Symmetry: D2
Subunit: 422 residues, 4 copies
């Protein structure tokens, strides 16, 4: 029965054609949903009670669209999100961190606009985790956003939105200096022929997967759900194909900001993503990712590949990684393991930001410290295991891969352990 669930017959197939033929509608998904859901906050999703429902439905990142609304409006939104998130902090083994992202208005007719500088300053002051920089056309646009974030905003992640021909053509230079990319299909579909957008989406997702950087698929994913309780056949297909393409995050705009079914739209994206993740052809995917990733003398990079290889060999339920900045979890994520990457961190900001990486499940470690570093480490490992058992990721008898470092401080991951649960 284990090998009949989560499309395992289709995952073992020798060819991609055999893989497609073996897809079974009766093979149920078992693993936790790996692709993060970004929901846009607006009138339909601003109440603390509504936001609690969206967190339970699966929202991982809350997007504030600075194209509409005042700073007072957005600060109220931020406060409501934080209130709804902290309403579940009572049970630290089941608490879900939610990132806050600021989507800039953009340059419009103009480089970096004066309103954008004021909005970016607002984001730093209000402690946002991510910036979705609108209409990025070159590497110098990213540098301008980075400069506007100042010294207090070094930790904020910059996700460049590609929305026009220039951004697509200069993609490589933008990706090099960005933390990730958003495939902003709305404007892109007006700037380039609508029938060419799928080529740009597939190219940008592929390059981001190659680079190991997060990529978000955005706009009109479940558009009809703004007024209707169920999406169209094209919409469910679109969500599924974005996940199959390799998107780290999927987004909802009007569907959650102004629609009549914001919670239902989140539930739909959650349901589709789970099905699509089980349908991933890991046999060729892991091989291609392995072959494409360059040789490395960075021990974190070397431990990540060894850990993902080890997890595939034993069908590990999870890979528990200790991370400070989230980097060790990101390097595990780039190899697209079938095993969940449970990232145990003390940094609340890192816990929110690792939602950008597919398959990373952040656990904010709030237990009291241990005096001996070795005991402190073991405690954070056992923490990941208890939360994993509570949340359904792990059972007694399961195998896990534990990824740690040799000394405290970020950048020293170099150990991989094969551990049996209880």
């Amino acid at each position: 029965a284990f090998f009949q669930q989560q499309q395992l017959p289709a995952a073992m197939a020798d060819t991609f054609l055999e893989h497609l033929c073996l897809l079974d509608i009766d093979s149920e998904p078992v693993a936790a949903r790996s692709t993060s859901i970004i929901a846009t906050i607006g009138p339909a999703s601003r109440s603390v009670e509504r936001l609690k429902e969206m967190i339970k439905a699966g929202m991982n990142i809350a997007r504030l669209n600075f194209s509409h609304g005042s700073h007072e409006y957005h600060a109220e939104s931020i406060a409501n999100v934080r209130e709804a998130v902290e309403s579940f902090a009572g049970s630290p083994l089941s608490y879900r961190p939610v990132a806050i992202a600021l989507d800039t208005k953009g340059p419009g007719s103009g480089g970096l606009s004066e309103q954008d500088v004021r909005d970016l300053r607002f984001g730093v002051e209000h402690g946002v985790d991510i910036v979705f920089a609108s209409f990025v056309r070159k590497a110098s646009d990213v540098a301008a956003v980075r400069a506007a974030l100042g010294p207090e905003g070094h930790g904020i992640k910059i996700i460049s939105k590609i929305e026009n021909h220039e951004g697509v053509k200069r993609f490589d230079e933008i990706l090099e200096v960005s933390d990730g990319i958003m495939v902003a299909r709305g404007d892109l579909g007006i700037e380039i022929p609508a029938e060419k957008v799928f080529l740009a989406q597939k190219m940008m997702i592929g390059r981001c997967n190659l680079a190991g950087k997060p990529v978000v698929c955005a706009t009109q994913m479940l558009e009809s759900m703004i007024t209707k309780p169920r999406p169209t056949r094209a919409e469910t297909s679109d969500v599924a194909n974005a996940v199959l393409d390799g998107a780290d995050c999927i987004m909802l705009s009007g569907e959650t900001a102004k629609g009549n079914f914001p919670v239902e739209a989140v539930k739909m994206q959650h349901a589709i993503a789970r099905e699509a993740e089980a349908a991933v052809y890991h046999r060729q995917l892991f091989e291609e990712l392995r072959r494409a990733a360059p040789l490395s003398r960075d021990p974190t990079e070397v431990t990540a590949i060894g850990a993902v290889e080890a997890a595939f060999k034993c069908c590990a339920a999870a890979i528990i990684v200790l991370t400070t900045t989230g980097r060790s979890a990101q390097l595990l994520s780039r190899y697209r393991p079938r095993a969940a990457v449970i990232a145990v961190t003390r940094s609340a900001q890192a816990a929110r930001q690792v939602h950008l990486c597919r398959g990373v499940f952040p656990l904010l470690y709030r237990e009291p410290p241990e005096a001996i570093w070795a005991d402190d480490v073991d405690r954070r490992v056992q923490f990941g295991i208890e939360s994993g058992k509570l949340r359904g990721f792990l059972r007694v008898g399961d195998l896990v891969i534990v990824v740690t470092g040799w000394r405290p401080g970020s950048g020293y991951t170099n150990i991989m352990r094969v551990l049996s649960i209880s």
Copy 2:
């Protein structure tokens, strides 16, 4: 010889890639499609697309198959639709550059345990009116297909039966249904209500893959450009859906309300045409052909053996087209199963076969009407040159191009065994 510009068009850098990841990374929005659109467009005829003038516009936009939905309307209504389609098609019989045959398909109302009384009457209507295809609704088992086949009276055995899979039973009994059907339609509308909406993409991808493996046509249907019923442009999810159905391996893409009752029927056809052309150039032929080749079983049928040699030969020289002489369409279908990048120009004396080959991806029919030559070898040469002259006239061929010619050793269907490499003069 061909130029650097030749190798930058139709996603050729992405097609030459050693891995699927490299292939995705090499996709270029500036790489323009050159080949003719190979995925057929099925448009549903209704109040929005019934007039002879409106139908002429849809043929020019790219409609290859006209679907008559027998869930709505009387026999008198559908016979008027058939007559209007035939009138609009024959309005271009003068100009060989604009004349294209259009298939007529009957979509049944559906069942009850088995074939309904109304369905038997509707199938009899189809035989009497000379329809080419039947889209049999709610097929759940092989005996359902046999019932449709039996209902296609003594005169309708040439009609193609495309079984619509619309429920859990049809998905579970897929293999037995495909074995006895001519092809499949992934009827996503009802399927999305019978099974969880989030599982439909799995059923679509599985059924397309199995149809590609079997060498049988598969249609992706319902809500492809749904918003275009009221809006002139589709959503980002809708264009993505059409593109992904083509990339998945669908032979045909369909329009229902978009053409039958919508405000932009011609614009919806134009949109599907535009997306399909882009998506066909983005197909990863390097791994696709290898997998199709490896998966297809060994064969001692000369048509099947010639088809693989012809597709292999066409890939080797970047052949502008594969010209195949076929009477039933079978030879063109066997070429099509290997998914060549070259156009399959099928020269036939059969008007029905010319209409039905629209079900197979990349098959471009040419109806030949010349009186037969006394020497068979001269009749073959005359039909082969007609394929080249038409090709030249339509933009597929130029002097200096290479084409692969597939013929047989003796007259009559079933003897295809020759593949020739010809230089266009």
Copy 3:
């Protein structure tokens, strides 16, 4: 039948990985196909008698090597005459006659920089006596090949030049030598003294791989069955060496002292024949054909395009043979480069081409002696029938087998463009 798929290592040939392939090798799986790797035997005192030469032709000798490092022109002319007498002693049965090529192995430059004066005299002797191949000793650069070609003059245009790589310079300048040569010989004797003995296997594997990539014949030579000069059976290392040269991709295997001066010249030929047959069945065609196909560049030459379609077609039906009509042998060489499991039966009227095609693996020459038919298509059919009749007589074909026939559209060399699937009657 089940028994068919148990012979000639077919389970090992169908394996998904190279590791699975090795694990499936069966010592009880008997070779059925004809031995495709040619045997070159050096003529000397042990193999000069007309009766002895008839035994070597029956044992499997395809090419007779005349070593111009030893003996006078008078000696070599007597050799040539004895070979031709023994070969023509079987010309009474044209359906079973075996052509034998005559190759001249030059003495070399020695201390000189380029072509020696004795080499010029020996090369002109070869042209005067009608030799087919030249094994040019110690080739170090492309200009060495040009010098041999110039010394052959205008009358020696058809002679094939196989460059012997015997030193570090030849290995380093390999690419420029191969570009201008008809093929290569891996002269392991001198090479093993010029470079460290433990590095020779790397040079052999590299040169064979590059020759296979280029589609040019490659010969593995020297000490293959060395112990058989005095002993009736070879060592375990010697049989392994012969088998591995075939598995590496060598078109020809050679015997030097083993046939020229040894006590068991016929037994050495029989041993090489037996090992090569075993090794050819153990070839992993699944990956090999895929790699050859992928590595070969796109082509607008119809012969090149027909060859790949024909090999692809032969694999699809497990064709017993590919019968090709050839004037120069080039059409057979282009089929051979794709390493088909099917025998390439080359029917030719050129006695020289019939002798030279022995350089290409899996090409079985048939010299057709009949005068032309007035109708060219009838002449073409008669030759094809001759191939079928010879192949039936020799055991390559049986009634019911499928065969691929490769012909051209007009008389004369360079016009191959047709591939046909034929059932043996």
Copy 4:
């Protein structure tokens, strides 16, 4: 190029020109062959073990010291010839020559002693002389038994029973020398520690032109099973009377290594020939060239795909360690082992990195020579009070001996494989360490 561009800038273009690295990075096997370079020098230590047969030509303690320096890893005693007194003198001479280098335990070279049985002859099973010879082996502390003419699983059970309770640690390598042994191969391999492809008798029992098929099949199955396989007989036959081998002989040795043989053997070449040391030197030189020419890109992928899923932490750690070593071009994998099993599981994935096995067991240190790429280090120090410190001292001993023998340099990356608790069977940790 981008998949090796950063590491190329770091390690240099000269690094990537050595040990057939361009040929090893090739996308196809055809490209791999085309890229083989005679100028690309081997850098890695010779990983295929050399088994030399001891006889009149190689019995003296002085001659044996020369053979150990030439590369001999296993000494074979052929019980088809000679008395027990003769073989005991041979064993004593081997041990004397081996211990003459024990002064420096950081550079000492352990040598296994293998007993090759006479065989059943006319009989159906284990002969009476074989029982006496096997008892002799147990009494004299031999490490391996090469059991002649094994034809079924019950033959290896008989050898195991004849070894008695004290010979439980001895490895049984079954010799396949006839059609029955080839046909029942799977049942024999299941119960054996490894196999020897005994080509001499096999070449007389089956057609000589079919032996290469049997060799290639048995090596492939042994590689798939993760068990040692020895290629034997007539490898450098001409070197019995001549100082240089033939072109077929060098080719044969190279092809046995390329086929996947863990060990290569010398029989008459060392036992009775005129050039026993030269034959060992030749096999050493060829094996080093052949190992660099291995197409690791497809090999590792195939080994990985063929090996079944495992819930054994040693098995899981071994594949993660080999994958990690390939990612950074690790100079070595240092593994702590008691029985040699952890080193054997690393070896089955055919890493290009040397597997430096640190052990306290002298028998395990001798027996790991059966596994390709395993370099045994016998640790003689007394245990530390804290187990974690004892472990670290052993790891450091491996790093220091690896630097001393040339395997490691400052700046190199190494993968360290250890367990979480003392005792055999608990390997579960993989560490990436930078050499300082």
